[PDB]
Amino acid sequence: PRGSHMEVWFMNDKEFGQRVRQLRESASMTREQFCDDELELSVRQLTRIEAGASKPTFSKIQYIATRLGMGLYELMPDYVSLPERYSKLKFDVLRTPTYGNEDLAEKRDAMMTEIYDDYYDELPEEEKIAIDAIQSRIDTLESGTAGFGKEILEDYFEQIFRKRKYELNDLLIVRLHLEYVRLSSCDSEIFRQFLKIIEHLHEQINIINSNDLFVLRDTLLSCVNILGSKKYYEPIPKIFDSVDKIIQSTQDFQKKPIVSVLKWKYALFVDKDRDEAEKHYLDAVLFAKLIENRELEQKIEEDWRVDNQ
């Protein structure tokens, strides 16, 4: 029962929003009643969907349908899942180890451009924000990212803090909240919140899908830099514990050198104990020798030299 088979007009963002409103209204529900606890779908998120300014993710359409008693395809007959080429590019981008490889970091940004050229403009909203979360930087505390103003992102952030189980896009979108922490004082609300996020991310390890663990790992590593920018070194060791325990379950091992460097830097610059630091330096070298990556080995050798001036 597709739109092409009934010969009807295709529902783009506006005219779909129009339908979602109709069905909600005629079922005597208001936005506040409809969204309920706002975990899956928020009131602000719904308003923009009805307005035609935001395209819903699969999980959101699913919820909108179930909440109206309808099937997914009864609501959106012409629904299609995310392009296979897009989902591949996203996956490759997120799984690229950058440190030590100049060549792979070049393929990474190449993929990102292909995403922006071909698929980004037609993704659902949550998916756009998650792609931006990969490498967008916020210059100003008042402003948002490109395309999206703060009030949107806040709504997504608040949604995630309440969630019991983070999806892959939640683990990405959180990374934008970190860019706001960078601009705020150590005394701020935003910072004390950011510490609660770290607490959440730890508990998420034994809750999220096994397959998503690699994104969580890298999100926890993003916190180390941020904690460093505020000289709040206390929770860094526990991050390392968790990152190592994730590396064990996943059997991924690509971040072993990155972690060992970060471990030496803590020992060297925070603890000022370069007997303990040199140990991790040697692990990273041994690793780079075993996988036979000269570039990585030379990078590790160089950084160690730089850090003893």
Other C-beta atoms closer than 10 Å to the C-beta of 26 total: 9
- Residue pair 47/31 in contact by the 8 Å Cβ criterion: yes
Query: In 3D, which of 99, 109, 110 has the Cα closest to residue 295?
Result: 99
Give the method used: X-ray
Residue 71 phi/psi, 5° resolution? -75, 160
Q: Tell me the C-alpha distance between 241 and 173, whole Å.
A: 23
- Angle (nearest 5°) at CA 78 between 163 and 13: 65
Fill in the DSSP letter of residue 144: -
Which amino acid does the sequence have at 284? A
Which amino acid does the sequence have at 297? E
- Please, how many CA atoms are within 13 Å of residue 34, restricted to the half-sphere of its CB? 27
Q: Resolution, in Å, please?
A: 2.9
Residue 141 phi/psi, 5° resolution? -65, -35
Q: Tell me the C-alpha distance between 304 and 300, whole Å.
A: 6
